[PDB]
Amino acid sequence: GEELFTGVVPILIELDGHVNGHCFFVRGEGEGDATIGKLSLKFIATTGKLPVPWPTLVTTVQCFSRYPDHMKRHDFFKSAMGYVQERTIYFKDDGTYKTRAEVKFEGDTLVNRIELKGIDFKEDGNILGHKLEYNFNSHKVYITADKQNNGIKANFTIRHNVEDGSVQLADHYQQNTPIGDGDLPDDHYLSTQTILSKDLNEKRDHMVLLEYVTAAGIT
Amino acid sequence: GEELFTGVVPILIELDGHVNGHCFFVRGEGEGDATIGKLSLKFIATTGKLPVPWPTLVTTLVQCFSRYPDHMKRHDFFKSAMEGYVQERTIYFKDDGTYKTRAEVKFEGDTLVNRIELKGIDFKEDGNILGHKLEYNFNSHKVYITADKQNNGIKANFTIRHNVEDGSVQLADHYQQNTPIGDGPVDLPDDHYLSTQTILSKDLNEKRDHMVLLEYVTAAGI
Ligand SMILES: [Cu+2]
Ligand SMILES: [Cu+2]
């Protein structure tokens, strides 16, 4: 399973989005290696301007996260190889995201097909009002093991920067389970870093992504 | 599950829709009498004007409220699955794009829900569908139902007649498969059919793109 991430692997990402009766779709193309922990993706909104700000959709392909030589026994995301990634995103004082995504290989490209449903967001609120900065800070992904579902649970809170100077908290609860039968880890975490940019020659509503993710927690 | 449909039951309907790179969603609320075969629903396009004329969606947006007479109470697959069943369809529009449909129909307390997804493929620009050349009308149709021992469910085949502004007719071939969700004591039926009648109206005080529905469907063949 690990041997598939030895080098560059092309990425395909599709997102089915439904928030407060607004339907949108996002295509994601790019590359990424797990030896460095790098991701380079360009997301395109093929349905005009998004009804929600980009940074909220960032959180919803860990498998390209770098696991050091002494932690290679703890990468569920690679052992699967696919898995499904379910999430619930609690935006504080704001709506919520339910997310289900299948992540498997399709030949050369690694594919992440997503469906999300946004419920009870506030009009002229921080999300539906696009009062979010085009930013993203660094975060930790606290990962534990789940023997009951042969998978993994994880908890973290994302800090979205607001235009006024305050901070938005999007509490994330996620569950992952393998698709095919056939390695759960100990309590570790994934340190993440992210830059949001744009292609100056794309007229479509888009987002360029650069990520660096590594693991830690085990000496 | 006959006892559940004794009287009036509230209905909830949602349609996840994608047709030729265009996105839409539709909410449906209403009631239904299975003792009569009556349905009264009001659908709302929460996304604004659909990229597709309503009458092509009427077929895919709950065949449990159909009236099966007292001598046909052994042939209602739909009522008996209520856990619910999964209704899958493929709608071939003649000389036009097609529809692929999936839906889950189950009870969530008082109301009955169908959660539906659909994908539209290979439709023509300035066609009858994408060009909105269909009259806001509908005709009467028969639903021939057969048994599926292998998948423990049923199938159905029929062709829908959509009226065109030309005075012509746009055909839509429907193929469907139903399979129970929970392990069912549900009995399968002999070859029979449902006679359907639909009326599409508008709520005068609603500004959103919408459609009001009235349906009378009863079972026959025995
Ligand atoms: Cu709006
Ligand atoms: Cu959709």
Side-chain angles (χ1 to χ4, degrees), chain A residues 1-61 63-219, chain B residues 1-66 68-222:
Chain A
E2 305 172 349
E3 295 79 6
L4 285 76
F5 297 93
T6 59
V8 181
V9 178
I11 309 182
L12 180 60
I13 306 175
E14 298 179 285
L15 182 133
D16 185 20
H18 312 130
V19 182
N20 287 178
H22 278 298
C23 206
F24 55 92
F25 179 77
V26 180
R27 274 175 185 155
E29 290 188 352
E31 319 149 28
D33 48 19
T35 58
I36 314 182
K38 184 189 65 63
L39 291 178
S40 63
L41 304 162
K42 295 186 179 182
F43 298 98
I44 297 182
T46 56
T47 172
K49 290 187 175 183
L50 296 183
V52 290
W54 283 103
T56 60
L57 296 181
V58 171
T59 49
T60 56
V61 290
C63 40
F64 293 100
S65 55
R66 178 184 179 271
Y67 280 89
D69 293 335
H70 61 83
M71 290 186 60
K72 286 186 174 181
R73 274 181 176 173
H74 296 264
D75 39 23
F76 176 35
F77 302 95
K78 293 185 185 60
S79 54
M81 301 297 179
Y83 69 98
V84 296
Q85 182 156 11
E86 289 186 333
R87 288 198 175 176
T88 43
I89 307 181
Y90 303 133
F91 295 87
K92 279 191 177 180
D93 298 341
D94 226 318
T96 55
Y97 286 164
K98 177 171 64 180
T99 297
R100 182 185 180 276
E102 292 195 356
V103 186
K104 58 174 60 179
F105 271 102
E106 289 184 1
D108 297 26
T109 69
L110 189 146
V111 189
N112 184 19
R113 307 176 191 273
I114 323 158
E115 179 182 8
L116 67 85
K117 193 162 188 173
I119 315 175
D120 293 331
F121 281 88
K122 300 179 177 180
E123 58 166 1
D124 278 329
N126 276 325
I127 309 299
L128 292 183
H130 303 70
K131 299 179 181 178
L132 272 180
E133 295 179 7
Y134 206 82
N135 294 336
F136 198 86
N137 305 338
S138 295
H139 299 81
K140 283 185 176 180
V141 187
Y142 298 88
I143 290 181
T144 68
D146 185 26
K147 302 179 180 180
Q148 296 176 339
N149 286 26
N150 226 33
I152 274 189
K153 297 183 178 182
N155 315 271
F156 59 94
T157 62
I158 299 296
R159 299 166 287 124
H160 293 114
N161 289 8
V162 205
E163 295 178 352
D164 67 336
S166 60
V167 174
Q168 184 65 260
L169 309 182
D171 305 357
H172 285 67
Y173 175 88
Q174 77 174 16
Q175 289 177 161
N176 302 340
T177 50
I179 301 178
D181 41 19
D183 61 356
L184 35 107
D186 306 332
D187 293 342
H188 66 271
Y189 64 91
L190 298 169
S191 65
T192 65
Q193 291 181 349
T194 290
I195 281 181
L196 309 174
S197 55
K198 290 182 169 301
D199 185 14
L200 304 177
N201 299 123
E202 281 182 356
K203 298 191 174 186
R204 293 179 146 187
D205 193 9
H206 62 278
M207 182 183 69
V208 188
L209 189 53
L210 282 82
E211 281 211 346
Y212 279 87
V213 181
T214 62
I218 301 182
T219 46
Chain B
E2 300 176 355
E3 312 183 41
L4 281 178
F5 292 91
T6 62
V8 200
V9 177
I11 313 176
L12 192 141
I13 296 186
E14 296 184 345
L15 188 147
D16 182 17
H18 298 124
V19 177
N20 289 155
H22 284 350
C23 161
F24 64 95
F25 185 84
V26 172
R27 289 179 189 169
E29 295 178 349
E31 321 156 19
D33 289 342
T35 50
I36 309 177
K38 183 190 64 61
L39 286 80
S40 56
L41 304 161
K42 295 192 174 184
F43 301 98
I44 301 179
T46 182
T47 175
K49 289 189 176 182
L50 307 176
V52 143
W54 296 97
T56 66
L57 296 183
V58 180
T59 49
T60 53
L61 295 174
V62 35
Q63 295 175 337
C64 57
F65 289 109
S66 59
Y68 279 74
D70 294 331
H71 57 83
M72 294 188 68
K73 287 192 172 183
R74 273 181 170 180
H75 294 257
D76 196 336
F77 165 82
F78 313 98
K79 286 185 187 55
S80 39
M82 317 307 302
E83 294 160 334
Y85 66 100
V86 173
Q87 181 163 4
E88 243 195 313
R89 285 189 177 178
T90 52
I91 306 177
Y92 304 147
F93 293 85
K94 188 178 181 182
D95 294 328
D96 219 321
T98 69
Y99 281 166
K100 280 186 168 60
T101 302
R102 186 181 200 174
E104 294 195 357
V105 189
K106 56 175 59 181
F107 271 120
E108 282 183 0
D110 316 320
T111 64
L112 174 55
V113 195
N114 47 50
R115 297 179 278 150
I116 323 171
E117 303 179 341
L118 79 86
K119 190 158 192 168
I121 310 183
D122 294 329
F123 282 86
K124 301 180 180 180
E125 294 182 349
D126 282 326
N128 290 321
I129 284 81
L130 290 185
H132 295 173
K133 300 181 179 181
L134 298 191
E135 302 176 359
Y136 184 66
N137 267 0
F138 208 75
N139 303 328
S140 300
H141 303 85
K142 285 183 175 179
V143 184
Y144 305 95
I145 298 178
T146 57
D148 277 29
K149 295 181 180 179
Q150 284 191 343
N151 289 30
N152 201 25
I154 67 113
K155 281 175 178 172
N157 318 273
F158 59 94
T159 66
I160 294 293
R161 296 166 286 115
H162 294 110
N163 283 334
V164 195
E165 299 178 0
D166 298 24
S168 50
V169 184
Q170 174 68 59
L171 295 183
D173 300 344
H174 292 57
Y175 300 74
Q176 103 179 1
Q177 294 174 155
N178 299 338
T179 40
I181 299 175
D183 51 336
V186 175
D187 206 346
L188 305 183
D190 300 331
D191 298 336
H192 72 277
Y193 64 91
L194 307 166
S195 76
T196 70
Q197 288 182 320
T198 300
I199 289 184
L200 322 180
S201 59
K202 288 285 199 299
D203 189 20
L204 302 167
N205 290 328
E206 184 66 18
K207 302 189 178 185
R208 295 174 152 184
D209 196 27
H210 63 285
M211 68 166 299
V212 191
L213 181 64
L214 279 187
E215 257 202 357
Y216 278 83
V217 178
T218 70
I222 309 177

mmCIF file of all heavy atoms in Angstrom, chain B residues 67-96, unseen atoms left out:
data_model
loop_
_atom_site.group_PDB
_atom_site.id
_atom_site.type_symbol
_atom_site.label_atom_id
_atom_site.label_comp_id
_atom_site.label_asym_id
_atom_site.label_seq_id
_atom_site.Cartn_x
_atom_site.Cartn_y
_atom_site.Cartn_z
ATOM 1 N N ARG B 67 -53.561 3.429 -4.631
ATOM 2 C CA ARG B 67 -54.618 2.678 -4.010
ATOM 3 C C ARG B 67 -54.661 1.290 -4.585
ATOM 4 O O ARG B 67 -55.008 1.090 -5.731
ATOM 5 C CB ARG B 67 -55.966 3.377 -4.197
ATOM 6 N N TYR B 68 -54.310 0.325 -3.760
ATOM 7 C CA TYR B 68 -54.504 -1.084 -4.070
ATOM 8 C C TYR B 68 -55.821 -1.544 -3.459
ATOM 9 O O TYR B 68 -55.972 -1.541 -2.237
ATOM 10 C CB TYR B 68 -53.341 -1.929 -3.545
ATOM 11 C CG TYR B 68 -52.113 -1.916 -4.429
ATOM 12 C CD1 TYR B 68 -51.280 -0.806 -4.483
ATOM 13 C CD2 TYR B 68 -51.778 -3.022 -5.198
ATOM 14 C CE1 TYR B 68 -50.155 -0.794 -5.286
ATOM 15 C CE2 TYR B 68 -50.653 -3.018 -6.006
ATOM 16 C CZ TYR B 68 -49.846 -1.903 -6.045
ATOM 17 O OH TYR B 68 -48.725 -1.895 -6.845
ATOM 18 N N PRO B 69 -56.786 -1.931 -4.308
ATOM 19 C CA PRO B 69 -58.103 -2.378 -3.838
ATOM 20 C C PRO B 69 -58.014 -3.573 -2.888
ATOM 21 O O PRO B 69 -56.967 -4.218 -2.803
ATOM 22 C CB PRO B 69 -58.834 -2.754 -5.134
ATOM 23 C CG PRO B 69 -57.755 -2.944 -6.150
ATOM 24 C CD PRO B 69 -56.678 -1.983 -5.774
ATOM 25 N N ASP B 70 -59.108 -3.859 -2.188
ATOM 26 C CA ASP B 70 -59.122 -4.879 -1.140
ATOM 27 C C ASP B 70 -58.761 -6.274 -1.644
ATOM 28 O O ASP B 70 -58.360 -7.136 -0.860
ATOM 29 C CB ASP B 70 -60.493 -4.918 -0.464
ATOM 30 C CG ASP B 70 -60.798 -3.650 0.307
ATOM 31 O OD1 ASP B 70 -59.845 -3.001 0.784
ATOM 32 O OD2 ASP B 70 -61.991 -3.305 0.439
ATOM 33 N N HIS B 71 -58.905 -6.500 -2.945
ATOM 34 C CA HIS B 71 -58.577 -7.797 -3.525
ATOM 35 C C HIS B 71 -57.178 -7.800 -4.137
ATOM 36 O O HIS B 71 -56.782 -8.759 -4.797
ATOM 37 C CB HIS B 71 -59.618 -8.191 -4.576
ATOM 38 C CG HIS B 71 -59.776 -7.188 -5.677
ATOM 39 N ND1 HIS B 71 -58.938 -7.144 -6.770
ATOM 40 C CD2 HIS B 71 -60.675 -6.191 -5.851
ATOM 41 C CE1 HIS B 71 -59.315 -6.163 -7.572
ATOM 42 N NE2 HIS B 71 -60.366 -5.570 -7.037
ATOM 43 N N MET B 72 -56.433 -6.722 -3.907
ATOM 44 C CA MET B 72 -55.064 -6.618 -4.403
ATOM 45 C C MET B 72 -54.083 -6.240 -3.297
ATOM 46 O O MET B 72 -52.965 -5.803 -3.576
ATOM 47 C CB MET B 72 -54.974 -5.591 -5.535
ATOM 48 C CG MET B 72 -55.720 -5.973 -6.801
ATOM 49 S SD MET B 72 -55.382 -4.839 -8.163
ATOM 50 C CE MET B 72 -53.655 -5.196 -8.485
ATOM 51 N N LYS B 73 -54.494 -6.415 -2.046
ATOM 52 C CA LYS B 73 -53.660 -6.028 -0.911
ATOM 53 C C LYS B 73 -52.441 -6.935 -0.734
ATOM 54 O O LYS B 73 -51.603 -6.692 0.134
ATOM 55 C CB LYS B 73 -54.487 -6.011 0.377
ATOM 56 C CG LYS B 73 -55.462 -4.848 0.474
ATOM 57 C CD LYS B 73 -56.034 -4.717 1.877
ATOM 58 C CE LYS B 73 -56.859 -3.448 2.021
ATOM 59 N NZ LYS B 73 -57.363 -3.261 3.411
ATOM 60 N N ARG B 74 -52.345 -7.974 -1.557
ATOM 61 C CA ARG B 74 -51.205 -8.882 -1.516
ATOM 62 C C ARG B 74 -50.166 -8.536 -2.576
ATOM 63 O O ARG B 74 -49.155 -9.225 -2.709
ATOM 64 C CB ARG B 74 -51.661 -10.329 -1.710
ATOM 65 C CG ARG B 74 -52.081 -11.044 -0.440
ATOM 66 C CD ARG B 74 -52.490 -12.471 -0.757
ATOM 67 N NE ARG B 74 -52.676 -13.280 0.442
ATOM 68 C CZ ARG B 74 -53.041 -14.559 0.426
ATOM 69 N NH1 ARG B 74 -53.261 -15.171 -0.729
ATOM 70 N NH2 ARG B 74 -53.187 -15.224 1.564
ATOM 71 N N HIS B 75 -50.418 -7.471 -3.328
ATOM 72 C CA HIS B 75 -49.570 -7.130 -4.465
ATOM 73 C C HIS B 75 -48.946 -5.740 -4.353
ATOM 74 O O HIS B 75 -48.368 -5.233 -5.315
ATOM 75 C CB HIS B 75 -50.374 -7.238 -5.762
ATOM 76 C CG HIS B 75 -50.808 -8.633 -6.087
ATOM 77 N ND1 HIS B 75 -50.178 -9.408 -7.038
ATOM 78 C CD2 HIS B 75 -51.806 -9.397 -5.582
ATOM 79 C CE1 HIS B 75 -50.771 -10.587 -7.108
ATOM 80 N NE2 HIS B 75 -51.762 -10.606 -6.234
ATOM 81 N N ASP B 76 -49.060 -5.129 -3.178
ATOM 82 C CA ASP B 76 -48.451 -3.826 -2.941
ATOM 83 C C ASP B 76 -47.074 -3.999 -2.314
ATOM 84 O O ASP B 76 -46.948 -4.109 -1.093
ATOM 85 C CB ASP B 76 -49.342 -2.964 -2.041
ATOM 86 C CG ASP B 76 -48.970 -1.489 -2.083
ATOM 87 O OD1 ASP B 76 -47.809 -1.166 -2.412
ATOM 88 O OD2 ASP B 76 -49.844 -0.649 -1.785
ATOM 89 N N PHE B 77 -46.045 -4.032 -3.154
ATOM 90 C CA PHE B 77 -44.668 -4.122 -2.682
ATOM 91 C C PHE B 77 -44.275 -2.878 -1.894
ATOM 92 O O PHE B 77 -43.566 -2.956 -0.891
ATOM 93 C CB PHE B 77 -43.713 -4.318 -3.863
ATOM 94 C CG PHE B 77 -42.269 -4.065 -3.528
ATOM 95 C CD1 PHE B 77 -41.502 -5.046 -2.926
ATOM 96 C CD2 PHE B 77 -41.676 -2.847 -3.824
ATOM 97 C CE1 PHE B 77 -40.176 -4.818 -2.615
ATOM 98 C CE2 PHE B 77 -40.349 -2.612 -3.516
ATOM 99 C CZ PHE B 77 -39.598 -3.600 -2.911
ATOM 100 N N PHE B 78 -44.754 -1.731 -2.362
ATOM 101 C CA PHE B 78 -44.326 -0.437 -1.849
ATOM 102 C C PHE B 78 -44.719 -0.212 -0.389
ATOM 103 O O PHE B 78 -43.900 0.234 0.415
ATOM 104 C CB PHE B 78 -44.898 0.680 -2.723
ATOM 105 C CG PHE B 78 -44.728 0.445 -4.195
ATOM 106 C CD1 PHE B 78 -45.764 -0.080 -4.954
ATOM 107 C CD2 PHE B 78 -43.531 0.750 -4.824
ATOM 108 C CE1 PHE B 78 -45.609 -0.297 -6.315
ATOM 109 C CE2 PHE B 78 -43.368 0.534 -6.184
ATOM 110 C CZ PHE B 78 -44.410 0.011 -6.928
ATOM 111 N N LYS B 79 -45.970 -0.515 -0.051
ATOM 112 C CA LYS B 79 -46.454 -0.338 1.315
ATOM 113 C C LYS B 79 -45.804 -1.313 2.287
ATOM 114 O O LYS B 79 -45.586 -0.988 3.454
ATOM 115 C CB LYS B 79 -47.972 -0.510 1.378
ATOM 116 C CG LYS B 79 -48.768 0.643 0.806
ATOM 117 C CD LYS B 79 -50.252 0.420 1.032
ATOM 118 C CE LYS B 79 -51.079 1.471 0.326
ATOM 119 N NZ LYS B 79 -50.765 1.531 -1.129
ATOM 120 N N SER B 80 -45.504 -2.513 1.802
ATOM 121 C CA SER B 80 -45.000 -3.584 2.653
ATOM 122 C C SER B 80 -43.545 -3.379 3.072
ATOM 123 O O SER B 80 -43.118 -3.885 4.111
ATOM 124 C CB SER B 80 -45.153 -4.927 1.942
ATOM 125 O OG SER B 80 -44.854 -4.799 0.563
ATOM 126 N N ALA B 81 -42.790 -2.638 2.269
ATOM 127 C CA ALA B 81 -41.379 -2.397 2.558
ATOM 128 C C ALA B 81 -41.204 -1.387 3.687
ATOM 129 O O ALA B 81 -40.108 -1.223 4.225
ATOM 130 C CB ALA B 81 -40.658 -1.923 1.307
ATOM 131 N N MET B 82 -42.292 -0.712 4.042
ATOM 132 C CA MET B 82 -42.263 0.283 5.107
ATOM 133 C C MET B 82 -42.306 -0.377 6.481
ATOM 134 O O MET B 82 -42.752 -1.516 6.619
ATOM 135 C CB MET B 82 -43.428 1.262 4.958
ATOM 136 C CG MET B 82 -43.676 1.720 3.530
ATOM 137 S SD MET B 82 -42.192 2.374 2.742
ATOM 138 C CE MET B 82 -41.763 3.696 3.872
ATOM 139 N N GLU B 83 -39.069 0.263 6.982
ATOM 140 C CA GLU B 83 -37.682 0.339 6.539
ATOM 141 C C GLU B 83 -37.568 1.082 5.212
ATOM 142 O O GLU B 83 -36.723 1.964 5.055
ATOM 143 C CB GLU B 83 -37.084 -1.063 6.411
ATOM 144 C CG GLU B 83 -36.945 -1.803 7.731
ATOM 145 C CD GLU B 83 -36.811 -3.302 7.549
ATOM 146 O OE1 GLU B 83 -37.306 -3.824 6.528
ATOM 147 O OE2 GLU B 83 -36.211 -3.957 8.427
ATOM 148 N N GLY B 84 -38.421 0.718 4.260
ATOM 149 C CA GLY B 84 -38.416 1.345 2.952
ATOM 150 C C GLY B 84 -37.751 0.552 1.844
ATOM 151 O O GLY B 84 -37.296 -0.575 2.046
ATOM 152 N N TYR B 85 -37.700 1.157 0.662
ATOM 153 C CA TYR B 85 -37.099 0.541 -0.513
ATOM 154 C C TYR B 85 -36.286 1.572 -1.293
ATOM 155 O O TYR B 85 -36.351 2.769 -1.016
ATOM 156 C CB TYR B 85 -38.176 -0.077 -1.408
ATOM 157 C CG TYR B 85 -39.115 0.934 -2.026
ATOM 158 C CD1 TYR B 85 -38.941 1.363 -3.335
ATOM 159 C CD2 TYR B 85 -40.179 1.458 -1.301
ATOM 160 C CE1 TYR B 85 -39.796 2.288 -3.903
ATOM 161 C CE2 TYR B 85 -41.038 2.384 -1.862
ATOM 162 C CZ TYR B 85 -40.841 2.793 -3.162
ATOM 163 O OH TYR B 85 -41.695 3.714 -3.725
ATOM 164 N N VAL B 86 -35.519 1.105 -2.272
ATOM 165 C CA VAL B 86 -34.719 1.999 -3.102
ATOM 166 C C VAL B 86 -35.166 1.953 -4.558
ATOM 167 O O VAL B 86 -35.059 0.919 -5.216
ATOM 168 C CB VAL B 86 -33.221 1.653 -3.025
ATOM 169 C CG1 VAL B 86 -32.433 2.491 -4.017
ATOM 170 C CG2 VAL B 86 -32.704 1.864 -1.611
ATOM 171 N N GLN B 87 -35.663 3.083 -5.056
ATOM 172 C CA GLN B 87 -36.184 3.163 -6.417
ATOM 173 C C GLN B 87 -35.147 3.716 -7.386
ATOM 174 O O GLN B 87 -34.754 4.878 -7.298
ATOM 175 C CB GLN B 87 -37.451 4.024 -6.453
ATOM 176 C CG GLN B 87 -38.095 4.144 -7.831
ATOM 177 C CD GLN B 87 -39.528 4.640 -7.765
ATOM 178 O OE1 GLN B 87 -40.037 4.965 -6.692
ATOM 179 N NE2 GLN B 87 -40.190 4.694 -8.916
ATOM 180 N N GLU B 88 -34.707 2.870 -8.312
ATOM 181 C CA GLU B 88 -33.722 3.269 -9.312
ATOM 182 C C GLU B 88 -34.352 3.335 -10.697
ATOM 183 O O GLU B 88 -35.173 2.492 -11.048
ATOM 184 C CB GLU B 88 -32.540 2.300 -9.318
ATOM 185 C CG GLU B 88 -31.218 2.940 -8.932
ATOM 186 C CD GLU B 88 -30.027 2.075 -9.294
ATOM 187 O OE1 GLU B 88 -30.059 0.861 -9.001
ATOM 188 O OE2 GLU B 88 -29.062 2.609 -9.879
ATOM 189 N N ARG B 89 -33.964 4.334 -11.484
ATOM 190 C CA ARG B 89 -34.538 4.516 -12.812
ATOM 191 C C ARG B 89 -33.523 4.927 -13.871
ATOM 192 O O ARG B 89 -32.463 5.473 -13.562
ATOM 193 C CB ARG B 89 -35.655 5.562 -12.770
ATOM 194 C CG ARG B 89 -36.952 5.077 -12.159
ATOM 195 C CD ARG B 89 -38.063 6.092 -12.367
ATOM 196 N NE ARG B 89 -39.342 5.612 -11.858
ATOM 197 C CZ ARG B 89 -40.464 6.323 -11.877
ATOM 198 N NH1 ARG B 89 -40.465 7.549 -12.379
ATOM 199 N NH2 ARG B 89 -41.585 5.809 -11.391
ATOM 200 N N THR B 90 -33.868 4.651 -15.124
ATOM 201 C CA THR B 90 -33.157 5.191 -16.275
ATOM 202 C C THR B 90 -34.188 5.685 -17.282
ATOM 203 O O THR B 90 -34.958 4.896 -17.830
ATOM 204 C CB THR B 90 -32.229 4.151 -16.939
ATOM 205 O OG1 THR B 90 -32.964 2.956 -17.221
ATOM 206 C CG2 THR B 90 -31.057 3.818 -16.029
ATOM 207 N N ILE B 91 -34.217 6.994 -17.513
ATOM 208 C CA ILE B 91 -35.236 7.586 -18.373
ATOM 209 C C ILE B 91 -34.682 8.020 -19.723
ATOM 210 O O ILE B 91 -34.036 9.062 -19.836
ATOM 211 C CB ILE B 91 -35.893 8.800 -17.706
ATOM 212 C CG1 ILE B 91 -36.430 8.426 -16.325
ATOM 213 C CG2 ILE B 91 -37.004 9.352 -18.585
ATOM 214 C CD1 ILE B 91 -37.033 9.589 -15.586
ATOM 215 N N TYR B 92 -34.947 7.216 -20.748
ATOM 216 C CA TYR B 92 -34.528 7.539 -22.104
ATOM 217 C C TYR B 92 -35.517 8.491 -22.764
ATOM 218 O O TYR B 92 -36.632 8.096 -23.099
ATOM 219 C CB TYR B 92 -34.399 6.270 -22.951
ATOM 220 C CG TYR B 92 -33.469 5.218 -22.390
ATOM 221 C CD1 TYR B 92 -33.720 3.868 -22.596
ATOM 222 C CD2 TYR B 92 -32.343 5.569 -21.660
ATOM 223 C CE1 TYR B 92 -32.877 2.896 -22.089
ATOM 224 C CE2 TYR B 92 -31.493 4.603 -21.148
ATOM 225 C CZ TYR B 92 -31.766 3.269 -21.367
ATOM 226 O OH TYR B 92 -30.925 2.303 -20.862
ATOM 227 N N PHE B 93 -35.118 9.745 -22.946
ATOM 228 C CA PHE B 93 -35.912 10.666 -23.750
ATOM 229 C C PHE B 93 -35.584 10.426 -25.217
ATOM 230 O O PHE B 93 -34.417 10.450 -25.609
ATOM 231 C CB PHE B 93 -35.645 12.119 -23.361
ATOM 232 C CG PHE B 93 -36.109 12.475 -21.978
ATOM 233 C CD1 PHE B 93 -35.299 12.239 -20.880
ATOM 234 C CD2 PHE B 93 -37.351 13.051 -21.777
ATOM 235 C CE1 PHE B 93 -35.723 12.566 -19.609
ATOM 236 C CE2 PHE B 93 -37.780 13.380 -20.507
ATOM 237 C CZ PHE B 93 -36.965 13.137 -19.421
ATOM 238 N N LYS B 94 -36.614 10.185 -26.022
ATOM 239 C CA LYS B 94 -36.424 9.830 -27.426
ATOM 240 C C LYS B 94 -35.741 10.950 -28.203
ATOM 241 O O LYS B 94 -36.198 12.094 -28.193
ATOM 242 C CB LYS B 94 -37.766 9.481 -28.074
ATOM 243 C CG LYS B 94 -37.644 8.923 -29.482
ATOM 244 C CD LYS B 94 -39.001 8.546 -30.053
ATOM 245 C CE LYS B 94 -38.868 7.968 -31.452
ATOM 246 N NZ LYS B 94 -40.192 7.634 -32.043
ATOM 247 N N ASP B 95 -34.642 10.602 -28.870
ATOM 248 C CA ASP B 95 -33.843 11.548 -29.645
ATOM 249 C C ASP B 95 -33.418 12.746 -28.799
ATOM 250 O O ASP B 95 -33.502 13.892 -29.240
ATOM 251 C CB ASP B 95 -34.615 12.014 -30.883
ATOM 252 C CG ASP B 95 -34.842 10.893 -31.880
ATOM 253 O OD1 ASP B 95 -33.976 9.996 -31.976
ATOM 254 O OD2 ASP B 95 -35.884 10.906 -32.568
ATOM 255 N N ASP B 96 -33.096 12.447 -27.539
ATOM 256 C CA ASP B 96 -32.791 13.435 -26.504
ATOM 257 C C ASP B 96 -32.012 12.791 -25.347
ATOM 258 O O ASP B 96 -31.940 11.566 -25.252
ATOM 259 C CB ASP B 96 -34.075 14.080 -25.981
ATOM 260 C CG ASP B 96 -33.911 15.562 -25.705
ATOM 261 O OD1 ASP B 96 -32.842 15.959 -25.195
ATOM 262 O OD2 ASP B 96 -34.852 16.330 -25.998
#
